[PDB]
Structure 1
């Protein structure tokens, strides 16, 4: 189908700072930076930007697609704030935030602490949750993965570290 990529406005609080391949973006939560296409650059007119390849062929426009989409999450990141819960399904399960050292008891003999890489906060409201608090959906991703990975819910119960909205068909059972 028809794709596109272009709409990326610079709201308030955020701050642009291009530099060809390299680029950052200040904001309440922070900034960032990342490699990109070498012979290609963006372009900050006023409120929006316009990524653009200096060559017309197949592996061209495609590079922009991931560019402008990547910057979206940035402004959204420094201003909006990024979250992602995790519900602990299973008896003895209970996450307990203690800052940079989440302490978990997931059935495994002995508890297991998952040091959180500086960049995302968490605070289980009840003795049963896990809420991520960061700006980089990238980074929060992994932390969210390893969190669930600690004991992802198996299709027979769901008893595991499922994401809040994690629709699991734990409906699996029987013999015959």
Structure 2
């Protein structure tokens, strides 16, 4: 029952490069790098990676778990990437993507224009469905949150942008 002790595998052909800090991961989706802590020691197998903490102090446990999760997310992003799926709901709400530019008409007097960073892209399979797809989970989450915040859900009628499947309490406004 410990993320820090739980091992990390390397499916497909993901590669990892070590360095005093700034551990790097490479694979089909792309590359990633994070300045991992110098205290948690990483052991590498042909396909399995493990993290060990020097002791059992509060700080070592905390940093151990965080680093293991961070490395795991780096590998999983490089392998499969990440995606946030947003489902905008409204009478005339719609979305459309031109390249790395996303235009949202969500009831405001003006459209809302959003720009993806180089590591992220917008799919927009439909006019009411958006998908932020990237490699870095943090970047994907931040972009998805910004899109959602452009017009967050409201309780009475459900209008607004929602993460696909997120629960939305609805009040029975009179």
Instruction: Give 4+ residue runs of structure 1 displaced > 4 Å after superposition.
Output: none
Contact kept, 8 Å, 1:14 with 1:27, in 2: the verdict is yes
- Who is 1:172 aligned against? 172
Answer yes or no: is the 8 Å Cα contact 2:25–2:33 preserved in 1: yes
Once the two structures are TM-superposed, the CA of residue 157 in structure 1 deviates from its matched residue by: 1.3
SS of structure 1 residue aligned to 2:146: helix
| Consecutive unaligned residues in structure 2, runs of 5 or more | none
- Separation (CA, whole Å) in 2 of partners of 1:42 and 1:130: 38
Mapped to 1, the partners of 2:106 and 2:127 lie a distance apart of 13
Q: Is the 8 A contact 2:40 2:64 kept in 1?
A: no
Q: Check whether the contact 2:22–2:36 (CA below 8 A) recurs between aligned residues.
A: yes
Please identify, of 159-168 and 42-51, the stretch whose mean Cα deviation from structure 2 is larger.
42-51
Instruction: Provide the rounded CA distance (Å) in 1 between the counterparts of 2:3 and 2:138.
Output: 22
* Between structures 1 and 2, the one with greater strand share: 2
- For 1:71 and 1:112, the matched residues in 2 are separated by 35
Matched residue of 2:98: which SS?
coil
Q: CA offsets per residue over residues 28-70 of structure 1, 9 Å max, x none?
A: 1112111222344322133222222334522112211111111
TM-score (norm 2): 0.91
Q: Which residue of the partner structure matches residue 50 of structure 2?
A: 50
1:118 deviation in Å? 1.6
Displacement after TM superposition at 1:9 (Å): 0.8
Question: CA RMSD for the aligned pairs?
Answer: 1.7
The size of the alignment, in residue pairs, is 173
Unaligned runs of 5+ in 1: none
1:61 is the counterpart of 2:86: no
Offset from partner CA, 1:89-120 (integer Å, 9 cap, x none): 11121010111110111111111110112211
Give the 3 Å change call, closer, same or farther, for CA 64–42 of structure 1 in structure 2: same
